Curated annotation (Swiss-Prot), chain A:
Organism the protein comes from: Xenopus laevis (African clawed frog)
Self-association state and partner proteins as the record states: Component of the HAUS augmin-like complex. The complex interacts with the gamma-tubulin ring complex and this interaction is required for spindle assembly. Associates with microtubules. The interaction with microtubules is strong during mitosis, while it is weak or absent during interphase. It is unclear whether this interaction is direct or indirect.
Protein name: HAUS augmin-like complex subunit 8
Highest taxon listed in the record's lineage: Eukaryota
Family, as annotated: Belongs to the HAUS8 family.
Residues in coiled coil: 25-52
GN (gene name): haus8
Length: 52, 52
């Protein structure tokens, strides 16, 4: 039983680490994808202010 | 979003600078004073042209 629960611990912690490394990679480019669209927001909103 | 409040306040400051300088020839207060001076002189001259 002690080797059985420590086989469940290894399954859980392996999955957590597999998620962390792939999820941080999604979050890293998700912020850059939002920043690349706020660049487009800022200049367009400012151009519209001059044209107003 | 701070840029929007900066730039919109700049436009109000520019419009109020223009009104401030043109005020003696555009603003109804000083145009009203210029009207009262003429209307007083007319309410004298119409009476001179009667009482001639």
């Amino acid at each position: 039983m002690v080797e059985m629960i420590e086989s469940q611990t290894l399954l859980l912690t392996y999955l957590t680490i597999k998620m962390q490394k792939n999820l941080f990679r999604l979050e890293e480019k998700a912020e850059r994808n939002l920043l690349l669209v706020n660049d487009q927001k800022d200049q367009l909103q400012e151009t519209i202010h001059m044209m107003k | 979003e701070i840029k929007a409040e900066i730039n919109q306040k700049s436009l109000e400051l520019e419009l109020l600078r223009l009104e401030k300088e043109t005020a003696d020839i555009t603003h109804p207060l000083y145009l009203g004073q210029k009207h009262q001076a003429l209307q007083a002189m007319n309410s004298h001259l119409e009476a001179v042209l009667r009482e001639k």
